[PDB]
Design a protein around this ligand. Structure first.
Ligand SMILES: Nc1nc(=O)c2c([nH]1)NC[C@@H](CNc1ccc(C(=O)N[C@@H](CCC(=O)O)C(=O)O)cc1)N2C=O
Ligand SMILES: Nc1nc(=O)c2c([nH]1)NC[C@H](CNc1ccc(C(=O)N[C@@H](CCC(=O)O)C(=O)O)cc1)N2C=O
Ligand SMILES: Cc1ncc(COP(=O)(O)O)c(CNCC(=O)O)c1O
Ligand SMILES: Cc1ncc(COP(=O)(O)O)c(CNCC(=O)O)c1O
Lengths: 405, 405
């Protein structure tokens, strides 16, 4: 950094603190990752200066000649990656992406079937304190009480009982592969659209390690920053019969000017995803996730669903008579960054919760493999099973320190 | 740029073309500007990797220690700048800022008084192809058909007729000062809330060159990238009495995790506006708009409202028999970037228009003064009064190139 340190030592100090913390801690938040320098250079570019309301070739402003190239690259690399018919790379968030789809297909008060929030569903899938749950009438479907796998009989029963205008599939915390085909079938049965929110698993879908929802859904929404390893932003993929409406939902509907600089970073992120070692990288996340789980089970921990088929895991903390809030706190001292997360049928609420959610995308990006996963679990065991021991804490500290050197 | 040109030649080439275009053309788009290198560096930082749903000290994730300072610098510097009691620096956009205000105070279908889109109002101030107009009952107030100044008598009439729950004040293409005192007076008569969208005029308000709306409005919304000269994003300003409700609207309401990297650049831009130099700048911005308006009228051009009191000016192109769309394309041919803009009581639709909107924020940023403004209007007169003349176009190009080097 050149001009920042000289003009804003306060902001620069904060960013340097953050740049060091990212290397110091062992980052297990499942949502997170670390982008390349190419990706940062694109969002730190001068594309922030351009107003480009509209779409490539159909803008509301002059001079969008070169910013149209960047959007088309993003769109055509996105279509190459997921094999969708159309792509909208302007959504600012995963939330704005969801909001735009819902905007396009639903009316105020329509009924929507989305995954139960404490079973794995996301905020924008029906929380009553989110716009989705205020704007629309969401009914939830859940996971099996003992296997913690989506109950497809439950999904079809809710579907037929509530007759939803659209069905949402996917999650923020479900460690198992989601069967898009059954979702498509149930929706056809009741004449509902299908929306797949692939945010968490988009990089895994991209590398062939998770079934692709594109062939089965009308609308596919994603973030560009979780397993896809891109800039913070959103994206909508859809059949070409919904394209004109999807694009109008984004603009002139819920958004204003896109973030061309972030759209250039999405373009770079997708570029990286199309390359062969992204497929390689993705396999290690999933392998590392598998390994981490097993290592955790060996330390005596209980995992919701018994393990994972993707990048994240959900620890049911109860048997260490722990809550997810203290677990989270405790590991933040020793350098492990996780996030408290409700568990299916959690006996407590989503402010305290009974578990921690963990993922390997970030550490895998920094080069950790199987044997370093074994140690992460070891340290989590040492720490969580001996919560007030200052000696356990400090031991934890050197071992984390030994991993991030 | 270090890694981009080697990682991604296709993206790098388009970013580089944009950069060249930004220097070679005369960027007159009124909502555009050029950010500092310090601002871009913050945007290209590692702060994009951090999930930070929540607010500083009240996150739903660990490791937010540094990002919390980033967000407090932005809020505290914003409050210094505009004297608000509370500030939300999380809106991804000016669209999302507005949406969060509406989500907090209005209930689906509620009646809102906003400025008409063709007399100057913004898309999110009631357009029927926008969520604002689809989600709420928007009635519009307009400008005098002769003097093109907001008709406060009209505002007050509609308020009493329609008794909205909220009155929106401000715009995208009004070139005169907005009297916030009368707006609040009217809102108070009819028991409505008053929200001011100062997106276009934040830098001026910050600099003491436009009456500040903060003391008259319950809510103040703004973008950070227009006359404020910050990164692309939004911000909400409000009285303590509404803060909690405003923060909840942004999250868990309408957004997900914030763009922490973008909040870092907002804090940088607020620091820059807090400096003494920024007041010099904004004074020149308006003086340049005054001089370019007068210069424009010397070449025969009619201006909506007779001139400008701010950073913006609107050309009614009817007298010279051209559409807004035609003027824009021709001016793009000689290297002058503007945007077609509807004009009050426009006989043309929003993609053709009978006018062009011009602003001096960005060219002032790049150092242009009074004499360059005389040249610009001369180059603009030359071109729009000789559209068929290829010899006129080449001359124009050279004068542009002489101005931008
Ligand atoms: N099952 C699950 N779903 C999610 O959407 C989710 C997770 N977990 N874990 C992390 C992340 C945190 N999201 C939160 C954030 C706010 C509230 C909320 O209910 N608070 C009401 C409040 O008023 O603040 C809940 C979960 N997240 C999703 O983003
Ligand atoms: N007064 C004013 N308000 C604004 O909100 C605004 C400006 N000017 N100028 C520039 C920028 C341009 N935005 C637009 C974008 C779409 C439409 C819109 O009404 N489109 C209609 C009909 C257009 C057609 O001819 O294709 C639609 O059907 O899409 C209008 C202004 N902008 C705000 O961003
Ligand atoms: C399934 C799913 N869908 C949308 C989002 C929204 O993203 P944002 O950029 O934050 O608006 C998410 C993000 N989840 C946060 C987390 O999992 O921690 C998501 O998982
Ligand atoms: C008055 C006014 N209010 C909000 C916005 C929103 O901005 P964005 O970041 O693009 O969502 C704007 C934007 N102006 C567009 C234009 O005037 O060029 C605005 O003017």
């Amino acid at each position: 950094m050149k001009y920042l340190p000289q003009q804003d030592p306060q902001v620069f100090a904060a960013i340097e603190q953050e740049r060091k913390r990212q290397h110091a801690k062992i980052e297990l938040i499942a949502s997170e990752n670390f982008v390349s320098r190419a990706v940062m250079e694109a969002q730190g570019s001068v594309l922030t200066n351009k107003y480009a309301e509209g779409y490539p070739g159909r803008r509301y402003y002059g001079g969008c000649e070169y910013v149209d190239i960047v959007e088309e690259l993003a769109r055509e690399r996105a279509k190459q990656l997921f094999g969708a018919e159309h792509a909208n790379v302007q959504p600012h968030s995963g939330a704005q992406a969801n909001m735009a789809v819902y905007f396009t297909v639903l009316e105020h008060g329509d009924t929507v079937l989305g995954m139960n929030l404490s079973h794995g569903g996301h905020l924008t899938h029906g929380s009553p304190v989110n716009f989705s749950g205020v704007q629309y009438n969401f009914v939830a479907y859940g996971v099996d009480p003992e296997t913690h796998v989506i109950d497809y009989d439950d999904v079809r029963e809710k579907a037929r009982l509530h007759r939803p205008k659209l069905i949402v599939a996917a999650a923020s915390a479900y460690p198992r592969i989601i069967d898009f085909a059954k979702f498509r079938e149930i929706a056809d049965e009741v004449g509902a659209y299908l929306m797949v929110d692939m945010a968490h698993i988009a990089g895994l879908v991209a590398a062939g390690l998770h079934p692709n929802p594109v062939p089965y859904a009308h609308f596919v929404t994603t973030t560009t920053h979780k397993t896809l390893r891109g800039p913070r932003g959103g994206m909508i993929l859809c059949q070409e019969q919904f394209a004109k409406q999807i694009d109008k939902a984004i603009f002139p509907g819920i958004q204003g000017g896109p973030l061309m600089h972030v759209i250039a970073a999405k373009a770079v992120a997708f570029g990286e995803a199309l390359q062969d070692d992204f497929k390689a990288y993705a396999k290690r996340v999933v392998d590392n996730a598998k390994r981490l789980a097993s290592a955790l089970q060996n330390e005596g921990f209980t995992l919701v669903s018994g393990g994972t088929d993707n990048h994240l895991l959900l620890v049911d903390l109860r048997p260490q008579q722990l809550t997810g809030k203290t677990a989270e706190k405790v590991l933040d001292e020793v350098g492990i960054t996780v996030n408290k997360n409700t568990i299916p049928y959690d006996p407590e609420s989503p402010f305290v919760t009974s578990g921690i959610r963990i993922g390997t995308a970030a550490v895998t990006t920094r080069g950790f493999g199987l044997e370093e996963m074994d140690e992460i679990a070891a340290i989590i065991g040492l720490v969580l099973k001996n919560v007030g021991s200052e000696q356990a804490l400090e031991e934890a500290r050197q071992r984390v320190a030994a991993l991030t050197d």
